[PDB]
Design a protein around this nucleic acid. Sequence first.
RNA 1: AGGGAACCCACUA
DNA 2: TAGTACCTTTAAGCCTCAATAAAGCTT
DNA 3: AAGCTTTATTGAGGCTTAAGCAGTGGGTTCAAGGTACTA
Lengths: 60, 60, 48
Amino acid sequence: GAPSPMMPNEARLRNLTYSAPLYVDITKTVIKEGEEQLQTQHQKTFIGKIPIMLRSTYCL
Amino acid sequence: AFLFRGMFKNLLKEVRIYAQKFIDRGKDFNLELAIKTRIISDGLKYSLATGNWGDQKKAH
Amino acid sequence: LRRNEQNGAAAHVIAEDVKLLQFHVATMVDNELPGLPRAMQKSGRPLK
RNA sequence: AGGGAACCCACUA
DNA sequence: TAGTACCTTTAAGCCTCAATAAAGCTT
DNA sequence: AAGCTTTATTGAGGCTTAAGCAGTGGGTTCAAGGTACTA
């Protein structure tokens, strides 16, 4: 479970997908009858892995 | 982006389905556990690997 | 359908099950009938 | 002494 | 109480409707 | 009398079926995740 920077050649050899993780921020506000709101911050939740085009900006 | 619009729409659909199932029970949901991160991941991976530009169930 | 006849049921239920049996026989013979769903498998590939 | 199918794509004349 | 097994593209034919018109039945 | 009514032609719409031959090769996915239930 430890993240390591995957090189494209290692992705070619090990049959991996050369993809980068996509993290998004969600703010959860709870509205309850007769009650206020609470804004909770889930910063950088993983929502998937975007395949990276080689030699683009977010390639290694 | 045409792929990612549909897959992010499906991500929000499954988040609303999960949270609806966990508010009809009168409980709280874990939002970091609500996100089905494999919707974007294997959807992009499938469409780039096969070349069919859509979902797995609409290959024709 | 035979079970729902022996464990007797509604005419609507028997009608729908006869309709499904008719669809299944027809798609076992021909799976290209227009104005009709394809007999696809769970993966979505239509049966031959 | 020989356990795959289907589809897609590229190609050959 | 954690864990494993099961539930669910177009081009040419043919056929079949609505719409007509002499012609016999009934003024 | 001139009105009424019936069986054979037309025109458009819908259905069906077809769309070259013979070769290589690769690539992917089929067969998949919730579950309901125990020793």
